[PDB]
Design a protein around this ligand. Structure first.
Ligand SMILES: Nc1ncnc2c1ncn2[C@@H]1O[C@H](CSCC[C@H](N)C(=O)O)[C@@H](O)[C@H]1O
Ligand SMILES: Nc1ncnc2c1ncn2[C@@H]1O[C@H](CSCC[C@H](N)C(=O)O)[C@@H](O)[C@H]1O
Ligand SMILES: O=c1ccc2c(O)c3ccoc3cc2o1
Ligand SMILES: O=c1ccc2c(O)c3ccoc3cc2o1
Lengths: 348, 348
């Protein structure tokens, strides 16, 4: 009877698992995580302390926050410790964890929280309701919801544009900062073109460590025209399928997982054409493991991403290392090399 | 650098965790889980076998199913094993697990899958987008989305009514079937009133084991008028706050977690009034543990439910055993007893 109970309560848990992303979204929107980050390690807050520090006016906000805090503790975003009340009952206090750090809006702009907000946004959320139809009828879930792909939608909705670009910028500020502690590959080159570089955050972090290097942040016009400027980095609006600006190396982070094999090869030809001989194409992506049933957080992340690609973009998919090696090979490249990994992002 | 990597990839995993409920919803809607249940234990299917057995017409459905299967395997809904292809590459085959059983629509009507479908339904899904407002401004997330509570909505939307009632019926068929292997409490009584019994599934399972016992399935008119009939069980339409039909015992499963303390006491007075002296009120609910940071599936389940109550219904909440004991005490009851547990549902 013990196996049945473990299996059934897992089923119930999975059936009510929309709670996690939605409670996380609310904790971010209520500034719970930044507030706890402000308190910092080992600084425990009761639900009442947190409503007070947030200056909330709702007399029932403390009990509501308590129930949110309890969700976050179960998913290890927060720790917690008991505090004895006068009448013998126990108050539960909650505290920072390193996870909470990555989900807080660090003044440096580096945060994973905007990534949660783009996926809970009402525009991408509707694509899931057309996924079952996409499988049975063909087509792509997102385009069936909207009659246009996600990038076309962003160009027509400035609010969603900012939400999308901020989620990418937050992630790659964190990731390139840790990448740069272990990657040589930019040291000896005159210039880098970030193809689909979004808001320029990746080059912002590359040039700040290697000034003198000329950064070319290349993306669609509606993305570059709403982006801040770092010195060393010049924004170029364009279309990577039309051409790619020339440089000493080309960089593509989280590009290929959004395009079919045939479209990846079209991007890679324009990259080829844009570089001199004996030059590099630097790719940053997750990699699918050869064995699919792992339950750790790294496998969950890349598996989540592959499902996101399935609903959001035609032909998008996460790939194995052998699948990346094949693309480079088909594109006339002669050397493929997996270099290092940071926060599940490989440099290839 | 190893702690930072574990924390950041957990953050990324949590930020993209809407995937799980939404991919599960699609696997249920595509009949993947019933099909695999039809194949049964140790009967491995490739993505192509599964598209064939489902008679899908989409030439890209096999690759799409593969990516869905991989999600389900990571969350342990399915197992998987490799199969070598002719050219040395490996195909991954997927197979049944006991979890898959609880998420399949067993011909007996017992399934946890309808529970997933009510929470992913577009009507409840919109309440989350008003939760942050509910905390800051007061009110209830669901009522702020719709201007009426969830039960009023069900009475005005027959489709959502059936979706809601089917999720409760599927769960309590499974739960009462296992409860009845270890509960004496119905053996020696003439009749039971199931207050808020929904579609009658719980009494259906009680009377089928104890015929001769008279079942009174009591719920709102829009619920009882769209429900099947089991012998021994008579449906009564009414309002538990107006009165409760009299009987030898009153049964309430998943009622109290939906009402504030003051409304629970109003229900309990009507239950009190409806029973003779020296008689029982039988409550089936989850119970919150005193210590809140557990990460097992039982704690996740009750924590998920408490967040669901927070967004869906005014005043709803999961409770501790001491909180249930207090309600019974305040209601004039003289004996409180936690009896047994089944699939995380306690009988009190
Ligand atoms: N021709 C094109 N079509 C579609 N997207 C393009 C494009 N050229 C560039 N892109 C961009 O590709 C990016 C994918 S996501 C942004 C990833 C960015 N490198 C980062 O990691 O922060 C988007 O910014 C999108 O606008
Ligand atoms: N006066 C009332 N107000 C609101 N809901 C009521 C009610 N009387 C009964 N209910 C019912 O309470 C039920 C809660 S959920 C159904 C639980 C059911 N016992 C089961 O476990 O299967 C709903 O069916 C709802 O319609
Ligand atoms: O979590 C992610 C990470 C990358 C990502 C991405 O590159 C694209 C391109 C279109 O939609 C996307 C969604 C994404 O979600
Ligand atoms: O997963 C669940 C279980 C029980 C449940 C419930 O009794 C009510 C009453 C109004 O909304 C509900 C949602 C629920 O979701």
């Amino acid at each position: 009877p013990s196996q049945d109970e473990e299996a059934c309560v897992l089923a119930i848990q999975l059936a009510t698992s929309t709670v996690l992303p939605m409670i996380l979204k609310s904790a971010i929107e209520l500034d719970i995580l930044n507030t706890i980050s402000k308190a910092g390690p080992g600084n425990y807050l009761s639900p009442s302390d947190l409503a007070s520090k947030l200056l909330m006016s709702n007399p029932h906000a403390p009990i509501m926050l308590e129930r949110i805090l309890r969700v976050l503790a179960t998913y290890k975003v927060l720790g917690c410790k008991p505090s004895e009340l006068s009448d013998g009952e126990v108050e539960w206090l909650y505290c920072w964890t390193p996870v909470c750090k990555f989900l807080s809006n660090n003044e440096d702009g580096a945060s994973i929280a905007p990534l949660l907000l783009v996926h809970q946004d009402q525009v991408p959320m509707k694509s899931w309701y057309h996924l079952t139809d996409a499988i049975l009828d063909g087509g792509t879930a997102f385009n069936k919801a909207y009659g246009m792909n996600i990038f076309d939608y962003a160009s027509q909705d400035p609010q969603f544009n900012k939400v999308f670009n901020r989620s990418m910028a937050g992630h790659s500020t964190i990731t390139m900062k840790k990448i740069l502690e272990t990657y040589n590959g930019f040291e000896g080159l005159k210039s880098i073109v970030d193809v689909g570089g979004g808001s320029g955050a990746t080059l912002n972090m590359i040039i700040s460590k290697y000034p003198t290097i000329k950064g070319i942040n290349f993306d669609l016009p509606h993305v570059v025209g709403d982006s801040p400027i770092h010195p060393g980095v010049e924004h170029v609006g364009g279309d990577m399928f039309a051409s790619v600006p020339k440089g000493d190396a080309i960089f593509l982070k989280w590009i290929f997982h959004s395009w079919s094999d045939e479209d990846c090869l079209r991007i890679l030809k324009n990259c080829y054409e844009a570089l001199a001989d004996n030059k590099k194409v630097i790719v940053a992506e997750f990699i699918i493991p050869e064995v699919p049933g792992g339950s750790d957080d790294a496998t969950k992340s890349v598996v989540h991403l592959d499902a996101v690609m399935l609903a959001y973009v035609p032909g998008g998919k996460e790939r194995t290392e052998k699948e990346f090696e094949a693309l480079a090979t088909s594109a006339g490249f002669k050397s493929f090399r997996k270099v290092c990994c940071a926060f599940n992002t490989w440099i290839m």
